[PDB]
Amino acid sequence: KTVVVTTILESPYVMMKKNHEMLEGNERYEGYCVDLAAEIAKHCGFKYKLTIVGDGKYGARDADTKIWNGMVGELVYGKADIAIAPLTITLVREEVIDFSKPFMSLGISIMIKKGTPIESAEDLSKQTEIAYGTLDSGSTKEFFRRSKIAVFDKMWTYMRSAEPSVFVRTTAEGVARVRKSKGKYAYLLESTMNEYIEQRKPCDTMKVGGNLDSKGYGIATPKGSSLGNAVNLAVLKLNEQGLLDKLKNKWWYDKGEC
């Protein structure tokens, strides 16, 4: 009956505590989703174990094997009972797993090294000196791969065939690439992560332009899971009580470093 929670090491949702090596179990972790997990478990009356997704991915269906990877896969194949992470609600995922209503609203955005002469996706698409990419799997990459909108289709055509690869394995790698590329690399990632990093030292990045879309993160469970109903009601209650807003402030701005 201990609920197995799959999540991902993504700041500031789930991070290793500074003294994690001296701790064990759930206590090794801290962050927005660690706090959210505790709140959801309290309101739903369950005990849980936090586990970091084995392959470190969000979740996508492998085009060759048709097998789902990441957190989505752990739910699909019964390795975890629930996913509490910044997992984007998308059509392809909705078809295979259940999602609570959004606990956070967001959109794809552009991260640049301060001073980079870019203000929008259109700007990126109309030039070649500044390379740009996305996480190598997940909703952002899929957004571009499937887009039929002129600007985005043009961006995908460039990104997919760009060499060396413009895609990264983790958000942290994308941020590092922006910071080390002297303005010659821009990273496409969710506004939530972008806004967080903008308030972290060395305070050398900036979110520019409006978001490309409007979507949300949902707490996921295996399709048909009896846990889904209570979890969804918990998310709505937590949002209405102002807890979710308090948590974003706690992990994004209260201790901002810039």
Ligand X SMILES: N[C@@H](Cc1conc1O)C(=O)O
Between 173 and 198, name the residue whose CB sits nearer to its own copies: 198
**8 Å CB contact between 49 and 25:** yes
Cα–Cα distance measured from residue 99 to residue 90, given in angstroms and rounded to the nearest whole number: 10
Helix pair angle (228-240, 32-44), 10° resolution = 120
Number of chain residues interacting with its own copies (CB under 8 A): 29
Identify the residue among 157, 165, 241, 249 touching its own copies (CB under 8 A).
Answer: 241
Vertex 115 angle, CA 109 and 118, to 5°: 45
Question: Which residues ranging from 29 to 68 are in contact with ligand X (CB under 6 A)?
Answer: 58
> Which among 201, 176, 208 has a CA at the least distance from the CA of 112?
208
Residues 153-182 vs ligand X: string with x where CB under 6 A? ------------------x-----------
Min CB(19)–ligand X separation in Å: 27
b/e burial code for range 41-71 (CB count within 10 A of at least 16 → b)? beebebebebebbeeebbbbbeeeeeebbbb
Identify what 57 binds: ligand X, its own copies, none; CB under 5 to 8 Å per kind: none
Tell me how far apart the alpha carbons of residues 72 and 53 are, in angstroms, rounded to a whole number. 10
Question: Smaller CB distance to its own copies: residue 79 or 154?
Answer: 154
Report the nearest approach of its own copies to the CB of residue 111 (Å): 21
Q: Does 86 bind its own copies (CB under 8 A)?
A: no
What are the CA-CA distances from residue 80 to residues 84, 142, 184, 215, 225 (Å)?
A: 11, 24, 40, 24, 11
Burial class of residue 135 in the structure, from the number of CB atoms within 10 Å of its CB (0-12 exposed, 13-18 middle, 19+ buried): buried
The contact mask relative to its own copies for 32-71 (x = CB under 8 A, - = no) is ----------------------------------------
Binding mask 126-165 for its own copies (x = CB under 8 A): -----------------x--xxxx----------------
Interface ranges with ligand X (CB under 6 A):
58, 86-88, 135, 138-140, 171, 189-190, 193
Binding site for its own copies (CB under 8 A): 89-91, 94-95, 99, 101-102, 105, 143, 146-149, 213-216, 218, 232-233, 236-237, 239-242, 244-245
